[PDB]
Enzyme design. Structure first.
Site, mmCIF file in Angstrom:
data_model
loop_
_atom_site.group_PDB
_atom_site.id
_atom_site.type_symbol
_atom_site.label_atom_id
_atom_site.label_comp_id
_atom_site.label_asym_id
_atom_site.label_seq_id
_atom_site.Cartn_x
_atom_site.Cartn_y
_atom_site.Cartn_z
ATOM 1 C CB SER A 85 -0.980 -0.018 1.185
ATOM 2 O OG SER A 85 -0.316 -0.250 2.414
ATOM 3 C CG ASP A 89 -6.729 -5.069 -1.655
ATOM 4 O OD1 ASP A 89 -7.409 -4.274 -0.975
ATOM 5 O OD2 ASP A 89 -5.484 -4.989 -1.757
ATOM 6 C CG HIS A 129 -4.973 -3.588 1.411
ATOM 7 N ND1 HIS A 129 -4.790 -3.225 0.094
ATOM 8 C CD2 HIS A 129 -4.468 -2.573 2.154
ATOM 9 C CE1 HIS A 129 -4.203 -2.041 0.041
ATOM 10 N NE2 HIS A 129 -3.996 -1.624 1.278
#
Lengths: 258, 258
Positions: B100, B209, B237
């Protein structure tokens, strides 16, 4: 690097290449005139054989496998693979790795006879509709067309494939094979059939594949619940030939988890 | 399994975890309150360390890294990573692996300072727009929400992350970090910036995700010319946390080719 063997698969004498020890992994070559196990998996077998018992099988009507006077349907190739697996000396399930037509056939066995399968690898595999003049030069053009712009043609590989494609018995079976596909409008399965694949699956796809668009992989990934995806850049329709080390390693990694 | 170290990265004291020998690989944790190197890479470091010098760095404002009174912009995190790399004792280029926010930061360095980078791994990485109340229970809900339905919560892991998220200095920097992102409408780059990534890249993505849709990976694959894709089923995720062995092996395989 590997030895050539023959076995009676439910009535169809079948030729395969073998190397390695351990869990059994069956490699299934793609379609196309002169397509067979050696030309498709030459550089991959050694790598995989370091960790598994590698078995590269020639499909019904291809390479050195029997070519009886029958109707060459996808159903017949699926049954053949089923019979080959049973005829082989396997203590348990086997992993199946197939390119294009070989992939469609492995997929078929994975739905109709999944009790025989542990894992499935679909590489530029046929199955989704998503959307050769038999000369040495024609073969060169075909290989260049199906591979990424950086693929270097290897005369030896071209001659070998051309030799298999010219063999009149092999050519006759190839013509019959393509005729059936042609009469169906292509080699495919309904997405509903594909959704029946329940074994862990690895969908391998070349970003520059002109035969099977990359979007096809995304659709396979949506349909197959236990599917992983491996997308390769600067790669055409034959990942195992264009990037053997890359493909072999990705396959080893996938199989190590399963 | 690894040792904790500190280094002055261009004025910002930085904390990192180190293990292994060989080519250097930097792991960058994701965003979120209490997110840092140990909680993000605990089970991955050992695996990677068998083949590389693993360096898990806490980003500016997170974990044990310095939290100066400044404006926490994406530009600042990129510069920080650049300074950390330079401050470290690397003989050559380094590979960067980020989740991320950590992925967006690695991507930024890969465009602005690619001479320092050999390979990039984007995992559920932020960057494309495509399209917490600070309680222990709130943390439990967050982890369950960002992971696949089969992920088993581990109290120890929850307590550790909650402890980092509660530290008032860490919380203050986190608030400032989120404020800037909020004021920009999110953490992203124009697709044109992403198209500038020229180093070999591996886009890792969980099919389930909820933060970064799987379609985002397909877009990254279209934009980054030398990008490979690895799609994982039953994964949210945080692939490195939900399936450490799977993620670590896929990364090892990718790095072995590069």
């Amino acid at each position: 690097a590997y030895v050539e063997r023959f076995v009676n698969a439910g009535g169809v004498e079948t030729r395969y290449l073998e190397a390695g020890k351990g869990q059994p992994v069956i490699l299934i070559h793609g379609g196309g005139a002169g397509a067979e196990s050696e030309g498709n998996w030459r550089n991959v077998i050694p790598i995989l054989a370091r960790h598994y018992r590698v078995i590269a099988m020639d499909m019904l009507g291809f390479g050195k496998t029997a070519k009886p006077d029958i109707e060459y349907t996808q159903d017949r190739r699926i049954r053949h693979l089923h019979d080959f697996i049973k005829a082989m000396n396997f203590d348990g399930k086997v992993s199946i790795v197939g390119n294009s037509m070989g992939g469609a056939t492995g997929l078929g066995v994975s739905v109709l006879h999944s009790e025989l399968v542990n894992a499935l690898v679909l590489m530029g595999s046929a199955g989704l509709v998503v959307e050769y003049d038999f000369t040495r030069e024609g073969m060169v053009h075909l290989v260049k067309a199906l591979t990424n712009d950086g693929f270097k043609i290897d005369d030896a590989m071209i001659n070998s494939r051309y030799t298999y494609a010219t063999d009149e018995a092999t050519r006759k079976a190839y013509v019959a094979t393509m005729q059936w596909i042609r009469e169906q409008g292509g080699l495919f399965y309904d997405p509903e059939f594909i959704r029946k694949v329940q074994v862990p699956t690895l969908v391998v796809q070349g970003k520059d594949d002109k035969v099977v668009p990359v979007e096809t992989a995304y659709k396979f990934l949506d349909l197959i619940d236990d599917s992983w995806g491996y997308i390769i850049p600067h790669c055409g329709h034959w990942a195992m030939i264009e990037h053997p080390e890359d493909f072999a390693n990705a396959t080893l990694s996938f199989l190590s988890l399963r």
